[PDB]
Design an enzyme around this catalytic site. Structure first.
Site, mmCIF file in Angstrom:
data_model
loop_
_atom_site.group_PDB
_atom_site.id
_atom_site.type_symbol
_atom_site.label_atom_id
_atom_site.label_comp_id
_atom_site.label_asym_id
_atom_site.label_seq_id
_atom_site.Cartn_x
_atom_site.Cartn_y
_atom_site.Cartn_z
ATOM 1 C CG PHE A 208 -42.751 0.827 -24.243
ATOM 2 C CD1 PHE A 208 -43.631 1.657 -24.926
ATOM 3 C CD2 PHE A 208 -42.812 -0.539 -24.476
ATOM 4 C CE1 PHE A 208 -44.571 1.130 -25.812
ATOM 5 C CE2 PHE A 208 -43.746 -1.075 -25.361
ATOM 6 C CZ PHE A 208 -44.627 -0.239 -26.028
ATOM 7 C CG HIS A 211 -43.746 -4.809 -24.469
ATOM 8 N ND1 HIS A 211 -42.858 -4.023 -23.769
ATOM 9 C CD2 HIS A 211 -43.090 -5.223 -25.579
ATOM 10 C CE1 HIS A 211 -41.716 -3.960 -24.429
ATOM 11 N NE2 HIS A 211 -41.831 -4.679 -25.531
ATOM 12 C CG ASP A 213 -40.611 -8.087 -28.228
ATOM 13 O OD1 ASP A 213 -41.046 -7.052 -27.679
ATOM 14 O OD2 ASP A 213 -39.397 -8.294 -28.427
ATOM 15 C CG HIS A 267 -39.107 -7.070 -22.782
ATOM 16 N ND1 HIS A 267 -39.804 -8.135 -23.317
ATOM 17 C CD2 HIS A 267 -38.888 -6.213 -23.807
ATOM 18 C CE1 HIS A 267 -40.013 -7.920 -24.603
ATOM 19 N NE2 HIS A 267 -39.464 -6.763 -24.927
HETATM 20 C C1 LIG Z 1 -38.363 -2.564 -26.303
HETATM 21 C C2 LIG Z 1 -38.483 -2.373 -27.813
HETATM 22 C C3 LIG Z 1 -37.237 -2.903 -28.521
HETATM 23 S S1 LIG Z 1 -39.974 -3.274 -28.422
HETATM 24 C C4 LIG Z 1 -41.024 -1.900 -27.892
HETATM 25 C C5 LIG Z 1 -42.095 -1.321 -28.861
HETATM 26 N N1 LIG Z 1 -42.518 -2.134 -29.989
HETATM 27 C C6 LIG Z 1 -43.539 -1.777 -30.774
HETATM 28 O O1 LIG Z 1 -44.246 -0.799 -30.541
HETATM 29 C C7 LIG Z 1 -43.767 -2.646 -31.986
HETATM 30 C C8 LIG Z 1 -43.666 -1.868 -33.292
HETATM 31 C C9 LIG Z 1 -43.654 -2.769 -34.517
HETATM 32 C C10 LIG Z 1 -43.692 -2.031 -35.880
HETATM 33 N N2 LIG Z 1 -44.276 -0.677 -35.830
HETATM 34 C C11 LIG Z 1 -44.409 -2.922 -36.896
HETATM 35 O O2 LIG Z 1 -45.245 -2.513 -37.678
HETATM 36 O O3 LIG Z 1 -44.021 -4.167 -36.815
HETATM 37 C C12 LIG Z 1 -41.046 -0.236 -29.151
HETATM 38 O O4 LIG Z 1 -40.938 0.694 -29.931
HETATM 39 N N3 LIG Z 1 -40.215 -0.698 -28.149
HETATM 40 C C13 LIG Z 1 -38.765 -0.877 -28.183
HETATM 41 C C14 LIG Z 1 -38.033 0.087 -27.257
HETATM 42 O O5 LIG Z 1 -38.865 0.724 -26.483
HETATM 43 O O6 LIG Z 1 -36.826 0.239 -27.238
HETATM 44 FE FE LIG Z 2 -40.146 -5.424 -26.623
#
Ligand SMILES: CC1(C)S[C@@H]2[C@H](NC(=O)CCC[C@H](N)C(=O)O)C(=O)N2[C@H]1C(=O)O
Ligand SMILES: [Fe+3]
Length: 328
Positions: A208, A211, A213, A267
């Site tokens: 990923f 980004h 948060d 991150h």
């Molecule tokens: C780094 C994170 C903790 S954060 C990042 C990424 N985050 C998102 O897409 C936000 C989703 C919010 C949710 N659907 C809502 O409606 O509020 C994800 O998944 N990622 C995680 C990961 O990849 O582990």
């Molecule tokens: Fe994140």
């Protein structure tokens, strides 16, 4: 690659009545927030072992049929009312990650925001109780467990900024919070689909991309597999894993409120071929919550930033993150 300084903060005093001990926690939160932006909350009182086990049983036993029946609109055109809550399917050979997102259990058909069809409010969808016994019960209870931990953490952030301890928490309410839980599975795959691996500018293989948060703060439990990196001025630094503590960081709403005094750390997630869990709780306020921006660096504490209602911030932020980093 260097390693980030992520301190472990005993957060237990934030549940108590010793005010001086709370200030000493607040100081550590301030220091971490002005440095790399991450800290581990320890002595939090949540049974994270039970959390990992229950989440594993769900991920490993749900079937393709159930996934379609729970899928968000992006994966199932029939479910036009599921933009946030539901299942985010993997795509074999193309997309490795899959997840299940759920919202405030109090969002029912009799809730005023549901009746009014306000954006970002949805009724949770759940699997069949007979095929996943005890799962919805555990998931709803966990929501309130980590809600309680987040309330205490928000007291720490308020005291750290020189505010009364309910400055943030007074807008973090069980009846209208837009906070979400996401149960993310990162699978072990052999062979691992190359399309599921992105390459950063610096050459690092990623799951990923970078980004900020979309949250006030993020309260994250992860398996004991190192994956996270935080951007600093000298480049990305590894965050070490710890599967007993919660990893805490600010979201961009906090950066807005404090005129970037507490930045939203950038991150990314390294690619690692290993079965693991990432279980974020995104702390969001109510749809109409507004906090007046302030600047802790000015004596007057005044800033020129406009107040931004949380619902509009959330709606804009969720779409932007999908468009930038893709559909998850
Ligand atoms: C780094 C994170 C903790 S954060 C990042 C990424 N985050 C998102 O897409 C936000 C989703 C919010 C949710 N659907 C809502 O409606 O509020 C994800 O998944 N990622 C995680 C990961 O990849 O582990
Ligand atoms: Fe994140």
């Amino acid at each position: 690659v260097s390693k980030a300084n992520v301190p472990k903060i005993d957060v237990s005093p934030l549940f108590g009545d010793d005010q001086a001990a709370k200030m000493r926690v607040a100081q550590q939160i301030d220091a971490a927030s002005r440095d790399t932006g991450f800290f581990y909350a320890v002595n939090h009182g949540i049974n994270v072992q039970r959390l990992s086990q229950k989440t594993k049983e769900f991920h490993m036993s749900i079937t393709p049929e159930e996934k379609w029946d729970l899928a968000i609109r992006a994966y199932n055109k029939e479910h036009q009312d599921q933009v946030r809550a539901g299942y985010y399917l993997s795509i074999p050979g193309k997309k490795a990650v899959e997840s299940f997102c759920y919202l405030n259990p109090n969002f029912t058909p009799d809730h005023p925001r549901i009746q009014a069809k306000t954006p970002t409010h949805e009724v949770n969808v759940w699997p069949d109780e007979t095929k996943h016994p005890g799962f919805q019960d555990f998931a709803e209870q966990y929501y309130w467990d980590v809600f309680g931990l987040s309330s205490a953490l928000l007291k720490g952030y308020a005291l750290a900024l020189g505010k009364e301890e309910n400055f943030f928490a007074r807008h973090f309410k069980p009846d209208d919070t837009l906070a979400s839980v996401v149960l993310i599975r990162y699978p072990y795959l052999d062979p691992y689909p190359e399309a599921a691996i992105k390459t950063a500018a610096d050459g690092t293989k990623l799951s990923f991309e970078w980004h900020e948060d979309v949250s006030l703060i993020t309260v994250l439990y992860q398996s004991n597999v190192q994956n996270l990196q935080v951007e600093t001025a000298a480049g990305y630094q590894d965050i070490e894993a710890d599967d007993t503590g919660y990893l805490i960081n600010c979201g961009s709403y906090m950066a807005h409120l404090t005129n970037n005094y507490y930045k939203a750390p950038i991150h990314r997630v390294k690619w690692v071929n290993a079965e693991r869990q990432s279980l974020p709780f995104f702390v969001n306020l109510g749809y109409d919550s507004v906090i007046d921006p302030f600047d802790p660096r000015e004596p007057n504490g005044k800033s020129d930033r406009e107040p931004l209602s949380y619902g509009d911030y959330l709606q804009n932020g969720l779409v932007s993150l999908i468009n930038k980093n893709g559909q998850t």
